[PDB]
Amino acid sequence: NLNETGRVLAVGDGIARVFGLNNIQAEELVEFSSGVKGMALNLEPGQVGIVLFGSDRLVKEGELVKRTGNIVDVPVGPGLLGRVVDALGNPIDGKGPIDAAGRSRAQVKAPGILPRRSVHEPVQTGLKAVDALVPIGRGQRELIIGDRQTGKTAVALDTILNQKRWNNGSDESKKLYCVYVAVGQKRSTVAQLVQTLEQHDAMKYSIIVAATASEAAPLQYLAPFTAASIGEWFRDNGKHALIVYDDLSKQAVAYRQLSLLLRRPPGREAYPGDVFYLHSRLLERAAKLSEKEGSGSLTALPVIETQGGDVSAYIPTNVISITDGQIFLEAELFYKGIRPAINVGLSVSRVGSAAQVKALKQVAGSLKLFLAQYREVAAFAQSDLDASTKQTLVRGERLTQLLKQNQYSPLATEEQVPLIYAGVNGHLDGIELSRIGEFESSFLSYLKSNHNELLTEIREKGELSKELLASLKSATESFVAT
Amino acid sequence: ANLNETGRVLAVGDGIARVFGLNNIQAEELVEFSSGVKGMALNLEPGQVGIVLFGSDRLVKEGELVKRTGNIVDVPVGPGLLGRVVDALGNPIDGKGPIDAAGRSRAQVKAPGILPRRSVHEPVQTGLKAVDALVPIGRGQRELIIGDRQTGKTAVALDTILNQKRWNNGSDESKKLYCVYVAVGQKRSTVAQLVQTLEQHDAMKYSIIVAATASEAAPLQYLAPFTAASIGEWFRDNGKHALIVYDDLSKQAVAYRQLSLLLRRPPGREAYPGDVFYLHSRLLERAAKLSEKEGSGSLTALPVIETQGGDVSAYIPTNVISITDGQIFLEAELFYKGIRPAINVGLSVSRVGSAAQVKALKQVAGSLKLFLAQYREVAAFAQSDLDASTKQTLVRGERLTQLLKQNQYSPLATEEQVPLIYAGVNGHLDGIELSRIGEFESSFLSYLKSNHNELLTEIREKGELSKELLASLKSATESFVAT
Amino acid sequence: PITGKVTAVIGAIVDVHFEQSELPAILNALEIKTPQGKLVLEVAQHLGENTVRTIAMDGTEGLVRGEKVLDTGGPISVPVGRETLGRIINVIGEPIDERGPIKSKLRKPIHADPPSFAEQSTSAEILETGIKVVDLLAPYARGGKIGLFGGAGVGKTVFIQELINNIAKAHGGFSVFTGVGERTREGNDLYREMKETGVINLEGESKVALVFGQMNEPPGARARVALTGLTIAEYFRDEEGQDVLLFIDNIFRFTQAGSEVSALLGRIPSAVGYQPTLATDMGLLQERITTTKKGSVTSVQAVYVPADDLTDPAPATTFAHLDATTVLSRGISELGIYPAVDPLDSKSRLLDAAVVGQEHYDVASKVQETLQTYKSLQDIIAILGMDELSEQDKLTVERARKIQRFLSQPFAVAEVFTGIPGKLVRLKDTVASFKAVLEGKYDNIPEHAFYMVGGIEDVVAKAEKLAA
Ligand SMILES: Nc1ncnc2c1ncn2[C@@H]1O[C@H](COP(=O)(O)OP(=O)(O)NP(=O)(O)O)[C@@H](O)[C@H]1O
Ligand SMILES: Nc1ncnc2c1ncn2[C@@H]1O[C@H](COP(=O)(O)OP(=O)(O)NP(=O)(O)O)[C@@H](O)[C@H]1O
Ligand SMILES: [Mg+2]
Ligand SMILES: [Mg+2]
């Protein structure tokens, strides 16, 4: 046959070099005599380079190889909600078949210049620090980045946890469906995560794509592209998806493995010359569509793991310049107690205010500053300090403590703005530093008992009218006094 | 279908054409392709010849005919090139028509050995106060101009080529110094504007421009300095004196590494090939002062090197430092401050110049060199005491500093330099305000030009100062100060 | 029609086979019709045995060995002339704005010889921008290259929009904006902002043309867009004899793209991982941007510095072509100065008596020396008091504080956002205006009369309103 079949010339290191398949498309899927699969990445004159999807003990020289006639694709649609699939959308959670609306390719062109609209709607993470200072909008690509063990997954996770507010609603246009892409994590870790999402009733609106540590490299490299199509189903049908690639360091590493084995020219850190294009191709697929096009949205939170803070490393540089901003975490701030360990100085959202609930923007306008100046003067916290510079030290301390937050405990916007109102305007200055914890705690429960109406107006109208500011100013002083 | 004077292109890519045949070709022989673009036979193997393209890869295709020249890469040389602007192969680019050549030297020519040479004794007077007093250049010498980007490197070369207006107008042949400016990797616009200045100051009539600009095939940039050397050499070889400026070697070495990498030569330090030193060394060795038996001709080289962030420790800088007979280092710190020429005194040296610097400057600049390398030292340690003895030396230091600032395109004759230095070293300026020293100069010149013109005449003709003449300037200066 | 067959696919690298001496030249565009549109390949090498090596301009998923490739018989070509104004154009010259085809007069190839040494203009000259800070202190070179620094939060896209407007209204020259590695969300932004601001008018007369080679396009496309866009600007100089503006945002992504393509083609990388051809690649772009006898292309290029290492090859190479800089600084915009130009960080090669005249230089010079003395006096004002200064220095802080507010300027395009009508301040105005203050003619004038005003006649006028 030879046009639709081939013979194995050589196999080793998850590469099978195959004679024939003369009619195979580039990036097409194949099948080996033993039933293991793989994709054709190298169309060369004499032969085809194929990367294996499973162990290469299962391929031998001489073996027969069949075309499938399919570019790698994945099931998509709502029937994937609450499911754990692998990179090709096979169910691994033991809940049986996946019901697919249709199918979509791993590789899809990102939306053009024309079919888009400026980002303008909040993805509310529920993290006081993030929502107030590094606000994320729908269609945005906001990187979570830091060294190991600094709270990176935690930030994405708490965001997913927070979507409950709207996902338990009927209003489809307010819901944010969630796609978590575990690339190279260990199986137990992923299981642990899934257990956590179940425990907080968030599994129901999530989809987990898991190309774990011991899975063949090309599955790890496919996983983010596959997951993207799954999330793209929502964006394409006027809904909104959030996608978390945890993490693109490990994907880059997988992609490098194949390239070095397929003997493609290596560059910086032995990465292929198309490793930027791997991540830009991917991350450009997050977008807010225009009206004509259904106004759907995909928001991306890629994660990057740096080595001892080096953002100049090859892959960190690529992703940092591809996305719309960084939430930057630090070991220092972590052990100091500041959790989330967000480095406000080195974090930004390039979308900015257009992505932030007006009510929060009104109180958070200043907070950006009262902390900026606090950092410029933070060095002075070691006796002879004049009135002006001590004042700024008092606020900064307190406002930093206000931004401290327990894990798996996202706040509502109407819970957030009061707290930040109190901080920003100076109602906390009196209260001693070790008590700002119990302050936030009681202040909210006192607000729920006695001022439920204001919270409701904040929640529903999102703005602060001059009347509300006054109602808030009074409520706060009232509680502070006791 | 001759396969001895002719070949067929097998493959072309990365600036290399691979050609079948050309059986009778020589190593480093120039070739001519179907399209008209030329090339050099770099490596000859069984079955094929590797050819480095002197143009875009576009211009060569697999299957095309390639023609022998029977010429090792060479150029038109001679006196007919004065006033012209040519490319690396000697092609006329000023639009002025066919080059009037006396002959054709090879691009690679071996430098004169131990014997045909003689010690420098004749000066290249730059007309720059700082240079000629501190780091004097002899005819036949190689001095390096080196510093950060935008630090007046070119202006030192330029005001030197300009300054030769004084001698190249007279009959005296031995004192005539023809100029060769080699633009390598520079913008076309710049070079064109520069040539505009050389004409504006008439200087174009005795200079030759060879240019391989920024967008030209790397091997044309690698070649430029060498063919420019050939041209400069004609004057050396025939008994006259030529000055050659390589602006700059840094960019040449960059062009060179490109080819080497594309040729797959092992990268070394900073990814430059192992032979990048040889590249420069063979070039600057061609700058020489010839013996009595060879006409006494001189080639003088002023290579320009660009440092990054003032680091003189880099591979390429130290390489060229180790080939030249000294360097004039231009500090970016002084240049931004206003002190221009921005010569760093401690870091600058001429290795052979002293014995070639005009004796007149030599006397009035008594220890000027070692002094300014020490005022600069005590100045940094000043910012613990308002001390007495070191306080007067600091005023001397600052007055000598402000005295060595000089305008561009304003080169001065040695006779104008000598009194200026006399007035500083001997402390006649120490009573004057800091912000007035520049005005003092041309007013002090005005005075010497319309009164004591008789001293100025003497200095020019002798090249020395007599005890009688020393006491003459003594009186002239002191009178001026109090008015 | 000259046909070939694909013999190899390796990512963005495509190998294609032809018949003897019937090979496309290096740099020629080849075409493959696809389900969607058309995959374009640019010839990079002749490998031998009638095969050529090409770089793709789009994805290569799904290509099959043996597929028909067509030779176009030339480099990639783009529509030129007035028909491009107001349109969005990709690397291969296709319209990407859903407005149908660019019904243009001719198409020029994107690879062009720079002007001859003989064709080169011999005198440096100022391109008058109407922006005070720029014209007085860091003037742009007509036909030169300007590096622009600073990102969001500093009004980059308004500054870029202002220059399009002024150049067109004041010199009758159009502009081309090339997005090299452009973030698509931000291309969508800019397009919508240009329509709101007037510099694009889908009905009226549009002053700018847009070319985007987006981040998600492969390395081939990103390397070549700067050329595509440049060519458009070139025709306005070559055929209409205009003083054109060319915008490159971001030039660094141009260099990284080349870096990526070289790596892909198997070339041994040079120092710090860059291409061995880094400098000639940069030349082959930049040398085409220049004054001729017909007109000039003046390019404003956004420059990003890796690791903040000024000596990194990428900047080091680029800086070898930049005639001047314009630095927009959050440190300026936080003081409420618009534009947010740093009056001391922005420098010019042309700020020289022989280029601008002895007067112009002398004003600018003392303007620059005054602001420095002010800067080194900020620290003693913060701790000691305003009164701890000499007679002449307590006058020159009062003077600088004014000069400073005078360097701000209301922009014409930003009126839709500001309500303040915009000033275009002529160069002669700007020199005279500042010359008059430096002599101390307006110490009687209060400070607020210098904020957001054009000429000195607007300072005379506004001061009378804040009184009577
Ligand atoms: N906001 C928080 N408050 C308190 N503890 C937290 C918070 N966020 C995370 N942690 C704890 O910090 C540890 C590390 O958090 P994690 O979210 O895994 O960071 P990471 O960057 O994903 N680490 P890794 O994935 O192993 O490189 C875990 O023990 C968390 O329980
Ligand atoms: N003595 C001087 N006084 C004042 N300005 C000068 C002087 N010499 C040179 N300049 C100017 O300073 C600028 C930079 O000097 P230049 O002679 O170009 O040095 P360079 O090191 O060749 N710079 P580049 O070639 O761009 O790396 C030019 O615009 C010169 O005209
Ligand atoms: Mg994690
Ligand atoms: Mg120079």
PDB file of C-alpha atoms in Angstrom, chain B residues 33-120:
ATOM      1  CA  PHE B  33      28.002  34.888 -11.855  1.00  0.00           C
ATOM      2  CA  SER B  34      25.283  34.833 -14.542  1.00  0.00           C
ATOM      3  CA  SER B  35      23.517  37.776 -12.876  1.00  0.00           C
ATOM      4  CA  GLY B  36      26.622  39.972 -12.742  1.00  0.00           C
ATOM      5  CA  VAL B  37      27.238  39.646  -8.994  1.00  0.00           C
ATOM      6  CA  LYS B  38      30.786  38.657  -8.098  1.00  0.00           C
ATOM      7  CA  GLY B  39      32.254  36.156  -5.620  1.00  0.00           C
ATOM      8  CA  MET B  40      35.471  34.763  -4.130  1.00  0.00           C
ATOM      9  CA  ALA B  41      36.649  31.169  -4.399  1.00  0.00           C
ATOM     10  CA  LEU B  42      37.222  30.447  -0.731  1.00  0.00           C
ATOM     11  CA  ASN B  43      37.597  26.686  -0.522  1.00  0.00           C
ATOM     12  CA  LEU B  44      38.422  24.240  -3.295  1.00  0.00           C
ATOM     13  CA  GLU B  45      37.554  20.592  -2.770  1.00  0.00           C
ATOM     14  CA  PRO B  46      37.257  17.513  -4.890  1.00  0.00           C
ATOM     15  CA  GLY B  47      33.981  17.790  -6.796  1.00  0.00           C
ATOM     16  CA  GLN B  48      33.130  21.425  -5.873  1.00  0.00           C
ATOM     17  CA  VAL B  49      34.238  24.957  -5.003  1.00  0.00           C
ATOM     18  CA  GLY B  50      32.763  26.999  -2.128  1.00  0.00           C
ATOM     19  CA  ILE B  51      32.246  30.641  -3.136  1.00  0.00           C
ATOM     20  CA  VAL B  52      31.565  33.570  -0.815  1.00  0.00           C
ATOM     21  CA  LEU B  53      29.051  35.983  -2.415  1.00  0.00           C
ATOM     22  CA  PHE B  54      29.780  39.709  -2.732  1.00  0.00           C
ATOM     23  CA  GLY B  55      26.036  40.451  -2.954  1.00  0.00           C
ATOM     24  CA  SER B  56      22.597  39.107  -2.059  1.00  0.00           C
ATOM     25  CA  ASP B  57      21.974  35.333  -2.207  1.00  0.00           C
ATOM     26  CA  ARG B  58      18.947  36.177  -4.349  1.00  0.00           C
ATOM     27  CA  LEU B  59      21.240  36.958  -7.302  1.00  0.00           C
ATOM     28  CA  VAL B  60      22.579  33.366  -7.589  1.00  0.00           C
ATOM     29  CA  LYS B  61      20.540  30.249  -8.557  1.00  0.00           C
ATOM     30  CA  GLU B  62      21.237  26.520  -8.898  1.00  0.00           C
ATOM     31  CA  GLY B  63      22.144  25.733 -12.524  1.00  0.00           C
ATOM     32  CA  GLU B  64      23.658  29.122 -13.421  1.00  0.00           C
ATOM     33  CA  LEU B  65      27.016  29.639 -15.122  1.00  0.00           C
ATOM     34  CA  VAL B  66      30.049  30.858 -13.131  1.00  0.00           C
ATOM     35  CA  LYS B  67      33.058  32.475 -14.851  1.00  0.00           C
ATOM     36  CA  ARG B  68      36.751  32.607 -13.871  1.00  0.00           C
ATOM     37  CA  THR B  69      38.649  35.908 -13.658  1.00  0.00           C
ATOM     38  CA  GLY B  70      42.197  34.621 -13.167  1.00  0.00           C
ATOM     39  CA  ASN B  71      42.444  37.347 -10.511  1.00  0.00           C
ATOM     40  CA  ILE B  72      43.040  36.914  -6.778  1.00  0.00           C
ATOM     41  CA  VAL B  73      40.697  39.417  -5.082  1.00  0.00           C
ATOM     42  CA  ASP B  74      42.239  42.754  -6.113  1.00  0.00           C
ATOM     43  CA  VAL B  75      41.554  46.510  -6.617  1.00  0.00           C
ATOM     44  CA  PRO B  76      42.348  49.550  -8.762  1.00  0.00           C
ATOM     45  CA  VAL B  77      45.041  51.625  -7.049  1.00  0.00           C
ATOM     46  CA  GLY B  78      47.025  54.773  -7.829  1.00  0.00           C
ATOM     47  CA  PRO B  79      46.743  58.574  -7.630  1.00  0.00           C
ATOM     48  CA  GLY B  80      43.629  58.757  -9.849  1.00  0.00           C
ATOM     49  CA  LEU B  81      41.433  57.701  -6.930  1.00  0.00           C
ATOM     50  CA  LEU B  82      42.012  60.942  -5.018  1.00  0.00           C
ATOM     51  CA  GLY B  83      38.650  62.726  -4.837  1.00  0.00           C
ATOM     52  CA  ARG B  84      36.634  59.561  -5.620  1.00  0.00           C
ATOM     53  CA  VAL B  85      34.328  57.336  -3.506  1.00  0.00           C
ATOM     54  CA  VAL B  86      34.442  53.579  -4.231  1.00  0.00           C
ATOM     55  CA  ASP B  87      32.999  50.340  -2.818  1.00  0.00           C
ATOM     56  CA  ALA B  88      35.023  47.401  -1.423  1.00  0.00           C
ATOM     57  CA  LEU B  89      35.799  46.043  -4.908  1.00  0.00           C
ATOM     58  CA  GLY B  90      36.827  49.533  -6.040  1.00  0.00           C
ATOM     59  CA  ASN B  91      33.609  50.208  -7.914  1.00  0.00           C
ATOM     60  CA  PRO B  92      32.919  53.909  -8.428  1.00  0.00           C
ATOM     61  CA  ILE B  93      29.904  54.951  -6.354  1.00  0.00           C
ATOM     62  CA  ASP B  94      30.123  58.762  -6.289  1.00  0.00           C
ATOM     63  CA  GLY B  95      28.608  58.624  -9.792  1.00  0.00           C
ATOM     64  CA  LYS B  96      31.741  60.203 -11.253  1.00  0.00           C
ATOM     65  CA  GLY B  97      32.521  57.538 -13.878  1.00  0.00           C
ATOM     66  CA  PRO B  98      35.376  55.077 -14.568  1.00  0.00           C
ATOM     67  CA  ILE B  99      38.197  54.953 -11.990  1.00  0.00           C
ATOM     68  CA  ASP B 100      41.530  56.187 -13.374  1.00  0.00           C
ATOM     69  CA  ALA B 101      43.851  53.485 -12.041  1.00  0.00           C
ATOM     70  CA  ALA B 102      47.619  53.157 -12.357  1.00  0.00           C
ATOM     71  CA  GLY B 103      47.284  49.407 -11.656  1.00  0.00           C
ATOM     72  CA  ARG B 104      45.747  46.713  -9.425  1.00  0.00           C
ATOM     73  CA  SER B 105      47.091  45.464  -6.070  1.00  0.00           C
ATOM     74  CA  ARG B 106      45.734  42.321  -4.430  1.00  0.00           C
ATOM     75  CA  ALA B 107      43.394  42.791  -1.445  1.00  0.00           C
ATOM     76  CA  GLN B 108      45.525  40.490   0.665  1.00  0.00           C
ATOM     77  CA  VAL B 109      49.138  41.650   0.444  1.00  0.00           C
ATOM     78  CA  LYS B 110      51.865  40.693   2.919  1.00  0.00           C
ATOM     79  CA  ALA B 111      53.262  43.383   5.221  1.00  0.00           C
ATOM     80  CA  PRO B 112      56.902  44.581   4.997  1.00  0.00           C
ATOM     81  CA  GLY B 113      59.261  42.417   7.086  1.00  0.00           C
ATOM     82  CA  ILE B 114      61.823  43.307   9.750  1.00  0.00           C
ATOM     83  CA  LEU B 115      64.293  44.911   7.342  1.00  0.00           C
ATOM     84  CA  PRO B 116      62.358  47.298   4.994  1.00  0.00           C
ATOM     85  CA  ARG B 117      61.214  49.364   8.007  1.00  0.00           C
ATOM     86  CA  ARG B 118      62.515  52.335   9.977  1.00  0.00           C
ATOM     87  CA  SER B 119      61.554  54.022  13.264  1.00  0.00           C
ATOM     88  CA  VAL B 120      58.893  56.762  13.095  1.00  0.00           C
TER      89      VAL B 120
END
